[PDB]
């Protein structure tokens, strides 16, 4: 069976502060596996206007295990958000991020 | 060489509009394969206060093979983003969307 990739949100730091991720983030949430991958600023600005440039970024997957149509993933979906926004809200001021939650639609 | 999945953002349309997105978007954008997954919204209301479950909502990928790290691939990654945003630019307003390389994140 072929894993959905669900998009969960970004996690940044400065290039210069380097972070172990792996002592601040846990490798599963919500019963699915949790991936972090580098990937190049997804924005070239900041909603001060600063540059992105500066930062690391890192774009958050869950790889969810199923067979159920699109439809059904909305439980699993809304657990994640409520459990990683849990765990990115206790992380050091210093890491920036943002949840599906901030991404909204209109 | 590696194959990097970029997020790029989400498209909707409503659920009782069924529009053909394999003949709406173009397979390819800037020699990058476009992936489109259905998914559940990532929010419960829009910026108006309706429900997005009148909405089908899909994550919209960007698959680009290439051998350049995270920092590296910015100039193509940007130029790929560009590119897609232009192709949604000329879908009709029925298809909603969001790209990141708009968003302005805190």
């Given at each position: 069976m072929q894993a959905v990739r669900l998009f969960q949100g970004y996690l940044w730091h400065p290039?210069?502060?380097?972070?172990?991720?792996k002592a601040l983030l846990p490798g599963e949430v919500a019963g699915a596996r949790l991936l972090w991958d580098e990937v190049p600023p997804?924005?070239?600005?900041?909603?001060?206007?600063?540059?992105?440039?500066t930062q690391r970024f890192y774009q958050l997957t869950l790889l969810v295990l199923t067979?159920?149509?699109?439809?059904?993933?909305k439980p699993l979906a809304e657990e994640a958000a409520e459990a990683l926004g849990e765990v990115l809200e206790g992380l050091p001021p210093e890491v920036g991020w943002l949840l599906l939650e901030d991404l909204r639609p209109l």
């Open positions: 290039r210069a502060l380097a972070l172990d991720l997804p924005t070239p600005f900041f909603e001060d206007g600063t540059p992105t440039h067979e159920e149509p699109p439809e059904a993933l």
